Write a protein that binds this DNA or RNA. Sequence first.
RNA 1: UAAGAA
RNA 2: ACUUAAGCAGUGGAGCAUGUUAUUUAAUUCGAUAAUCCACGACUAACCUUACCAUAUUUUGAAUAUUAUAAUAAUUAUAAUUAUUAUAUUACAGGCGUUACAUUGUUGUCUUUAGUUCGUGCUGCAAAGUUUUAGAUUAAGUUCAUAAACGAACAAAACUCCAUAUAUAUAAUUUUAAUUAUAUAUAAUUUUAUAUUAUUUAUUAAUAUAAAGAAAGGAAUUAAGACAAAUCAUAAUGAUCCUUAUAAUAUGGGUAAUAGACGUGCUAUAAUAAAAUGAUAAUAAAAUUAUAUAAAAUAUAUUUAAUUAUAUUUAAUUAAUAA
Lengths: 144, 209, 263, 287, 41
Amino acid sequence: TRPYPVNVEAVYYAPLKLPIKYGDLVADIQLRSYDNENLDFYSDFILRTGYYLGIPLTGPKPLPTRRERWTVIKENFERHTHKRLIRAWDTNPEVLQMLIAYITKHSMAGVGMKCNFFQRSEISSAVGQKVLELLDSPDFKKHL
Amino acid sequence: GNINNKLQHLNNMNNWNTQIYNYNKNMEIMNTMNDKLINKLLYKMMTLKLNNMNINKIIMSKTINQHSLNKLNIKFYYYNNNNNYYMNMMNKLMNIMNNNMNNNLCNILSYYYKKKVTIEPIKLSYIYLNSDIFSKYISLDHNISMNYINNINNINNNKYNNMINLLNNNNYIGNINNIYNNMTIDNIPMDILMYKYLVGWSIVKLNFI
Amino acid sequence: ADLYMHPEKWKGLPPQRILELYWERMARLGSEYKPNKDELNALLTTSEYSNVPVNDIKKLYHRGEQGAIDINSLRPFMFDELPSQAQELVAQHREQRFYNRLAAYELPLLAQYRQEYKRPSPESHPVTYRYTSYVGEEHPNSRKVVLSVKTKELGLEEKSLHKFRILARSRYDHTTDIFKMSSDKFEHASQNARYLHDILQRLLAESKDLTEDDFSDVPLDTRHTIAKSLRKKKRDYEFPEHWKRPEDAPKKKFDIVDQLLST
Amino acid sequence: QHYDESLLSRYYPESLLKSIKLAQQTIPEDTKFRVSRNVEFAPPYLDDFTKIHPFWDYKPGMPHLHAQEENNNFSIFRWDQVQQPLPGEGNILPPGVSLPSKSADVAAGLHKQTGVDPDYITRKLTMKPLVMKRVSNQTGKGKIASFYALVVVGDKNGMVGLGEGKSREEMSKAIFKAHWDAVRNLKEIPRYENRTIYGDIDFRYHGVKLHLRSAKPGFGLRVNHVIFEICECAGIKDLSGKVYKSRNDMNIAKGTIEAFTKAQKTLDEVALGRGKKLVDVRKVYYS
Amino acid sequence: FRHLKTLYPDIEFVDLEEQYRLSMVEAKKRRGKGAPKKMKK
RNA sequence: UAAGAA
RNA sequence: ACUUAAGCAGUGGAGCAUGUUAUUUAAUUCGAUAAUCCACGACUAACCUUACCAUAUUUUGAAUAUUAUAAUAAUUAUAAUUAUUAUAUUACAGGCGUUACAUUGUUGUCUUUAGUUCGUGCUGCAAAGUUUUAGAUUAAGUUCAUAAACGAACAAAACUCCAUAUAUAUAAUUUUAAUUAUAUAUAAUUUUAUAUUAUUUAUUAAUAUAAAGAAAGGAAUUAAGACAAAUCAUAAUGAUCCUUAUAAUAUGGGUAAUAGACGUGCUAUAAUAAAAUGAUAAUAAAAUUAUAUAAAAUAUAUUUAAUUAUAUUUAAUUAAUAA
Ligand SMILES: [Mg+2]
Ligand SMILES: [Mg+2]
Ligand SMILES: [Mg+2]
Ligand SMILES: [Mg+2]
C-alpha cells in the first residue's frame, strides 16, 4: 500500500557497513560515557552517517570499562567509564572531516569523543625567557 | 521496565543532574561546579513581585544539565500559579531565559561555560507530578499493571502474527509495511509508556506506575 | 522575518498573527520595549478576535499586568498531564525520533559528498602522522603529534640505515622496524608536526652523511626493546604440527534433501 | 525495495524526494538487512518520519538539546500553558476510571451486594438517626475513640429497619454504615388499618419493658421519643405506650422492632389458626 | 543576584535569603539586642 | 386513656 | 535465642610506631565525668593545614542595601539621566562563642516488622470480638495448611542486581589480553527415579543410592518505637554572647614536651626457618599516569658484572597501545 523507501527501512535495521578495500586506517573515534545507552545509540548513528558518507567503519568495538571507586567511612560508591571504538578506513581527509563535523553537530548528552587521525605522508620556554631577564637584572649582574 | 525501549525505561543517564563526559577531568569538575552554582542562581531567580502585596513564587525542580559535544541544555520543570495583551511576570522571566536580544540569560551562561547554552523550561500544571516541586511547594496498582501487561502481550502477538503471515505468503523477512501492519504511532506509544499514573504517595515520595 | 520589529506593517493580517507579532515584540525587546501607536491600533483590530473591550485592551497595553490587577493548588487531577518522570521517557522518545528522521532524510543527502579514496602510495608516503582531537574540549594532549615510519621504507643504503637506527636509539624498535617519535612541546599540533618533520630531516641528513663516521663498529642496542618486551606477556607457542589428526576430523555425511533442494 | 520516482511523488513530500533518490542510489536493491541484537534505533511502530507529530516530536521553535534554530530564533514567547498537550483525546484516563448523595451511594452499593432496588431506596425511604455516640477502647497505645450510629429507615408503609454503624474516623462514615445496615435489615411490620398495632404488647427486650397499646383514629403517637421515630418510619400513626426498667435508647430501639414483629398476630393469623371468624365491630358498623 | 537588577530592570527579583536576613536584623534591633556601633577612628 | 431528659 | 561455655587457629611479657590519659607548658587546639569498663576522629600537623600560644598589625572587614563624591562608557538638548568601577556612609559583616543555647530534623545503635490499617461479612443488647490456633514445618517466616470470614493497601516474599554457565552481536585478532573485551538475551528458588526410615500415609519429609544439570555464593530494596549524639565535621532555624575584637592578617612557636598507665599496630626472640643466589627472565589481579608518569642508557657509592640507592638525561604514553 504505502511505499516505504530504502532509507526509511534502513532505520529499522542494523546500520550498514561498507567493505574495507585496502585497510588504511585513517581515523579511530573513541566514545566515552558514564552510561552505555546513549553511547551505543550514538555509535549506531555514527555508523549510519559514515555509511552514507562512503566511509568504511568497522564497528563499536567494546573497550574495557574503567571502574573508579570511593569509600566513605563503609558506604561504597563507584563510577564506570564505558568506552566504544569506531575505526575509519580508506577515506580521504575531507570526507572524514565532514563525518566529524556532522556527528559533533548532532551529539548526545553525556558522551565525550576523542578522534585520532592517521595521515600518511611523504618523507620530505617561559622560565628560560625569565631566567635571562633575571640574570640581566642589576641584582644578579652586580655579582657578575 | 524494558531497557531496549526508550518509552519503557528511564535512561540511566537521567539519574544524574549533570550529564557529561569530558576527557579532561579538570574541565568536568569545573562544569559540575558551574551547574550547581547556576542551579542556585536560578532558584534565586524564581521569586518575582509586581509591587508590594504582589509576590509570585515560581517553584522549579532541580536543573538537568545536558552536556553534549557542542552545546549545553539546561532543562527544568517549573510550576506557577485578556491575558493576550500584556506579559505577566513569569512570561517575562522565561523570555529573558531565551528570547531577549541583548542580555538574555543563555548568552551570559554561554560565556560562563565557553560553549553554547540553551534553557528549556517545562511547565507542570499540577504540583504532585514532580516530587521535588511538590516538596518545595509543601515547604511554603495491580489493575493498571495487568492492563499494561495485556497491552504488551497484544502488541507482541500482533507483530508475531504479522511476521508468520509474511512467511506463509537469510534472515530478511520482507517489506517493513507488513511486518509492522497494525503497529502505528496512534496506538503503540502511549500504551507502552511507563510512569503515567501516580499510584502511591507519602508526604515526599511519589510512586508513579 | 523582522516584521515584528516594524509595527507599521501589522495593519491587516490575521488577528492571531497580530497577537503573535505583539508577543514577539515584547519577548525580544524586554525592557527596551516601549509603546508604539501603530502596534496599539493593530491590537485594537484584534479587539474582536478576543472577547475584550477596546478600553480594556488600551488599559492593559498601557499599564500591563498592573492594569489587569486593577480591572489554585491541590486541584483535582484531570488525567490530562503526565508526571515529569513519564515526560522524561517522552523526551527520550522525542530524541530517538529526531535521530530517526535525521537518518531517514538528512543522512542520505550526505551521499552527494562522497569522494573516491585517493590512496597515497605506500612507497611514496611511508611516514604516518597521528593527530589527536578531543571534540568540544580544551585538552592539553590535543597538541601532540606522533610520527611513525618503517625504517626499511626510508630509501637508505645499508650503512646509512644502520647509522639511522643507531642514532634513533630508543625510538627505533628492531622487532617491528618502527621508528616512532612524538612531540607535544609546542602549543599547537601544526608546530609539533613541523618540528617532528624537521627532526626527521636532520636524522636522515646525518644518516646519509657517511664522510666522517658510519658507526659500522657500533652494534645495534636492543636493551630498551628487551625491557619493553619483558612487560608484555608472550604467548609464543603453537599446537605441534605432528600432533594433528586430520583422520579424526568429522566428515560431512551425504544428505539427499539438501542436494535435491539446490536444484 | 526500490521504487520509481513517479510513484513516490504521489506519496512523499517534494522536499524529501532528493534524499530518497540518493538513498536508493547508494543502497543496492539486493541489500540484506539485519536486525540489531542489542541497540534499538527505530521506534517499536512504523513511521515514515514525514510528519512532525505535535506530541511525540520536539515542538518546533522550542529550545532543547537538539534544537536546530539559533538562540535568537526560538518562536515560543508564551509560557502560561503546557507547550505540548497530550495526543489523541487529550487524556490518559485508565480503562475503568472516571473523571472527577450518601443515600445514592448506599443504594448503589446495596443493589450490587444484595440486588435490592436502588430507586426504592433513594425515593421512598427516610432515615432518622436515633443515637450517635463516641465509644472508646483502651489499648496499649492509648484510647481509640470510635463513632457509633444507630439509625432507623422506613417507607411509612409497614417496612422498617434498624441499622448500626461504627467508624474510627468520621461520624459521616458511621452514619453511612448505619444507613446501609438499616436498609439491609428492612422488615415488614403488621399494622391494623395501616395506622396502629393490632392489640396490646407487653414485651421484654433485655432490660427494657415495653408496654404498647393500640389507639383510636386521630389519637397521636403518645410514646417514648425513640418509639416515636420508629413509628414515624414504620407508618404507625396511633399508639400509646410506656417504657419501664431500662430506658437505654439503643435497647428501646432494637426491642420495639422485635415487639412489632414477634409479639403481634394479625386477625387473619388468629382466625386461620383457631378456625374462627374475627370480625371488627367498628369496620362493620359503618357498613 | 545583584547583577539582575541591572540586566533586567523591568523584572524586580526578590532574594528570599536577603529579605529574611534584613527582617531578622530589624527584629533584633527592636528588642535592643542589635549589634553595637562599631568603634571609629 | 399512661411519652421522658441530664 | 544475642551472650556465655566448649573446640580449632592464633596473638599476647621486649623495642619501636601510633593514639588516649596524666603531668608539664606561653600553647601543649578540641573530645569523658548519675559507681563494672570506657575522654581515644584523621585518606597524611615542618611553613600551610590550625582550630592553640607569643608578638606585631587591620577595623563596614567576604556580603547585600542606602546616600554622597571622583572618574569612565552610553543616551538626551550644553549640562543632565543611565550604568561600571573606586573612595567614603551605616545598617551591618564576621565568630573552630555558648547545648548549663532549645527546637525540629538527620545520623548511629538497639527492639519489632507474616504484621498495621481500611473495606465488606459474621458474633455479642453493647463496649468489643472476628474465634481453628498455643497449627505443622524450617537453622530461619523458611515452606505449607487451616478457620465466619473474605479481600485490598502497604510490609515480607517473589522480583531485581552482582557473580557463575551458555547463545547472538561487535573487533578488518598490530590498542591482542579472541584463554579477551561489553552490549543484549537465556538459565535454577534445580529436577527425576528408586530403597530405608518416620509421616497428618503421598501426590509428604529426611537420608542413601542412581539419572540429568556448569549451577556452588552474594547484595540491595518498609515502616514503627526506644535511647545516644553539638568534630551535629548529618544541617537548619531560633535564642544568647563578642563587635579596636570572642572578628581579620603576618612572623615565629605549639599540636612532636616526659614521670607514669593503657589500646592498637609493626619488627623480633633460629632449623616444620632465616639468609643468599636463580636472564632466551616460573606464575597474578586490580588500579594509576595533563596539578603526570617516568623506560633504556650513562655516572657515583663500587668491588669484572649483577644487586641496591641517588644523580645525569627524559624514550614512549595522557593510555585495551607506553610507563
Ligand atoms: Mg603549624
Ligand atoms: Mg602560622
Ligand atoms: Mg550573625
Ligand atoms: Mg576564631
